[PDB]
């Protein structure tokens, strides 16, 4: 089959872990939730496709400049992920993840990726979210994020429930694939 | 890898590795603590496994059925020996640690108390200063590893052949040669997060606290060293 690598790129506690393991193992895990993702590689078959997809973690790189770079040679595609939770981890997609991204991958196709969407419907996350005079990420605000940062698609999904989380890996498929 | 160690650490967790009649009698916080540190462990000899995988099936298979120049293949495996030296060391006290702490009687029931003490041994002093040189090392030829395996990919069809045979096991689906780079310089990154996670079910005993808040001050001025000591060679 053909081979292609996917990174998942965005700040720490948006969910990169979560959602890569909950993928690769097909369950969310009901005893334990691993701290930390090593590699897998996905047998997908999209669209009459298939396609061997190898899964990059960069949880814990990135307080590390010249380290976190060496995940990036050879990549078809990133997700680039956001907290649907955290407003400010959405500030942070055009300040540092895309001029990064570009830089080093520049026309390697980007999928934003709003994680924890349950969390949109929380009554504990609407109040401490209120108290820095706040609301979770809109459906729109993210859409308008991945229009202004030249994003290949946007897409919402929620670790958790495992609602939409197919769908992303699908869709990077497909994306590596053009 | 040993059948007996690969059995200890097949279970998804540490609550599912004991027998329920013994994890019945520990308190919640303890199993999430153990959870943790069976996470560290299991990781670190899924680590070493990846570098003997590189020294014994990748480098020897390369000097001992190819026959190319020690100088390439030194180029496509930097730093091997020592990192499997390092490695291999840090496991083989982890392991003892939890042999130690086994109930009589039992071959899986244990619980671990005092961690902290062994990762501040492994990150200070002179076993500190080689894991900062070797991954210093490690880490500027990464590219450069990543480019010699393409090129000698591409050209010539035996290194193909051998590629394709030592890779063909369904054990190793994820290890083969640029994995396995990868896999060995994201390594560090993982010790901060499984050592924060311990030390966030470790408040029990004062002493533990403090050792793996140690621990924790250590591997990060590791990582930031190492980091600071990277430039990426190149050639062609
Ligand atoms: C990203 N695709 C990238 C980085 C470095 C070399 C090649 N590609």
Redesign the interface.
């Known amino acids: 089959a053909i081979r292609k690598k996917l990174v998942i790129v965005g700040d720490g506690a948006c969910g990169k872990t979560c959602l890569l393991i909950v993928f690769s193992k097909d369950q969310f895990?009901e005893?334990?939730v691993?701290?930390?993702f090593?590699?897998?590689?996905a047998d997908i078959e999209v669209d009459g496709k298939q396609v061997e997809l190898?899964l990059?973690?960069t949880?814990?790189?990135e307080?590390?400049?010249?380290?976190r770079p060496?995940?990036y040679?050879?990549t078809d595609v990133i997700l680039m992920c956001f907290s649907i939770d955290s407003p400010d981890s959405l500030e942070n997609i055009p300040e540092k993840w895309t001029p990064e991204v570009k830089h080093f991958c520049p026309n390697v196709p980007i999928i934003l990726v709003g994680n924890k969407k349950d969390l949109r419907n929380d009554e504990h996350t609407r109040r401490e979210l209120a108290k820095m005079k706040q609301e979770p990420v809109k459906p729109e605000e993210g859409r308008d994020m991945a229009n202004r940062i030249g994003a290949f698609g946007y897409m919402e999904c929620s670790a958790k429930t495992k609602d939409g989380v197919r769908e992303v890996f699908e869709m990077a498929t497909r994306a590596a694939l053009q | 890898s040993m059948e007996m160690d690969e059995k200890d650490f097949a279970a998804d967790s540490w609550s599912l590795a004991v027998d329920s009649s013994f994890l019945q009698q520990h308190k919640k916080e303890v199993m999430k603590q153990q959870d943790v540190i069976y996470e560290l462990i299991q990781t670190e000899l899924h680590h070493v496994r990846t570098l003997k995988i590189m020294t014994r099936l990748f480098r020897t298979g390369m000097l001992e059925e190819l026959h190319l120049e020690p100088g390439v293949v030194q180029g496509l495996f930097p730093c091997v020996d020592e990192l499997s030296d390092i490695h291999t060391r840090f496991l083989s006290q982890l392991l003892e640690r939890r042999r130690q702490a086994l109930c009589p009687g039992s071959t899986r029931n244990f619980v671990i108390h005092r961690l902290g003490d062994l990762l501040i041994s492994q990150f200070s002093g002179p076993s500190a200063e080689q894991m900062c040189k070797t991954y210093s090392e490690f880490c500027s030829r990464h590219s450069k590893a990543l480019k010699l395996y393409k090129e000698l990919y591409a050209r010539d069809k035996r290194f193909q052949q051998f590629i394709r045979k030592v890779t063909r096991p369904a054990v190793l689906k994820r290890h083969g040669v640029q994995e396995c780079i990868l896999l060995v310089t994201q390594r560090i990154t993982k010790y901060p997060l499984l050592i924060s996670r311990i030390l966030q079910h470790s408040h029990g005993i004062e002493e533990e606290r403090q050792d793996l808040t140690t621990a924790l001050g250590l591997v990060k001025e590791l990582l930031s060293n190492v980091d600071e000591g990277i430039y990426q060679l190149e050639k062609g």
């Open positions: 895990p005893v334990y691993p701290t930390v090593e590699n897998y590689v190898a990059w973690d949880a814990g790189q307080d590390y400049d010249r380290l060496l995940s040679p050879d």
